[PDB]
Amino acid sequence: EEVKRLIALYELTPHPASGGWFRETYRSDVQVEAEGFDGKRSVLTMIYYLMQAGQPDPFHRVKSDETFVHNLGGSMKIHMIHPDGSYSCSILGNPLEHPEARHQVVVPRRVWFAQEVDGYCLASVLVAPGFDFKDFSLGKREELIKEYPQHRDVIMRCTSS
Amino acid sequence: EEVKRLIALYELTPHPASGGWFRETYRSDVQVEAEGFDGKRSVLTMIYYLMQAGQPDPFHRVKSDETFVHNLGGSMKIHMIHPDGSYSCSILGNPLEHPEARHQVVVPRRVWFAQEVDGYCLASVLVAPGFDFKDFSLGKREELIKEYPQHRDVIMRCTSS
């Protein structure tokens, strides 16, 4: 597989909280303070992230804008549920093959998001201020359905029991 | 051309200080203070940047790490001259086609750098702290040769008279 060659070359490993493969490749020396964050943070972090068909990356949330950039493969569907209860969907990919896709997608801070692919996709994902486990939340199925009953179907598909 | 379709779709325009095509697509709301910068700065900025054969992007320098990410096309050669006078070269591209190329390249703050391609390349380029004209320097041919006489050849090729 091309997938296996990519995993070997970029030295990726299974992601604890999801279905894909990852590695953190960069973490900035420069540290900054920001309102709403508990303590100092790196200004920027970057990973590789690779996904396959059949396993969604379940709903999750952070305190920073998160920037997705397309490297190789098919399209990636990014689901979003905003604070006011509205839902949207952005397509990450190559517009020369898929006219409504784009090479860059930014998901706004504090939005609940999840993703799925039809083939495989290799992306680079960045966050600023930089990633810290204290700023991260994994979504709970029953709590999400309680808050957003109008989105039961998509929530069921992109969460664990 | 595929190049012309890309310019139209992503709405790019000629870059003032170089040979390629660009547009700033993202600029973070969050502002931070950092030692060595004159005043507050955005935490992160992003552009698209597209290059063609025959025109180099001439030597230049900034105060932040700069992160290159490969989207489409052939390989891109990134020349670097470090503060201690040493020279290095990184290849941005797809290792499935070009075994020594990589999809991500980070150039360290305060390094003089330039680039060239053999075909065409579309990349996404990010900087943190975010870009501000007061942090930017365009290299002068005679001043660069005075400081780094051992690198006369490459300097001649990647600067204007």
Q: Which residues of A touch B33 (CB under 8 A)?
A: 32
User: Where is A121: in which H helix or E strand?
Assistant: strand A120-128
CB contact under 8 A, A96 and B48: no
- Burial, A26: exposed, middle or buried (Cβ in 10 Å; 0-12, 13-18, 19+)? middle
**Cα B143 from Cα B59, distance rounded (Å):** 12
Strands (E), chain B: 13-14, 21-27, 31-32, 41-42, 45-52, 57-61, 65-73, 76-81, 87-92, 104-107, 112-117, 120-128, 137-138
Please give the DSSP secondary-structure letter assigned to residue B136: -
The CATH number that applies at residue A93 is 2.60.120.10
Overall number of domains in chain A: 1
- Residues B126-160, buried b or exposed e (16+ Cβ, 10 A)? bbbbbbbeebeeebeeeebeeebeebeebbeebbe
Please give the DSSP secondary-structure letter assigned to residue A19: S
Tokens of B79: 């020349």
Residue type, A120: Y
Residue type, B98: H
Q: Which method, experimentally, gave rise to this model?
A: X-ray
Q: Which of residues 96-135 of A touch B (CB under 8 A)?
A: 96, 103-104, 106, 122, 124, 126, 128-129
Distance of CA B50 to the CA centre of its chain: 11
CA distance B70 to chain A (A): 6
User: Where is B4: in which H helix or E strand?
Assistant: helix B2-9
Cβ-nearest to B95 among A9, A106, A126: A9
Q: Does A136 touch chain B (CB under 8 A)?
A: no
Domain with A116 in it: 1-160
**Cα A137 from Cα A125, distance rounded (Å):** 17
Counted across chains A and B, CB pairs separated by less than 8 A come out at 85
**Cα A161 from Cα B57, distance rounded (Å):** 53
Residue B51 in contact with residue B120, Cβ under 8 Å?
yes
Nearest Cα to Cα of residue B30 among A109, A113, A67, A38: A109
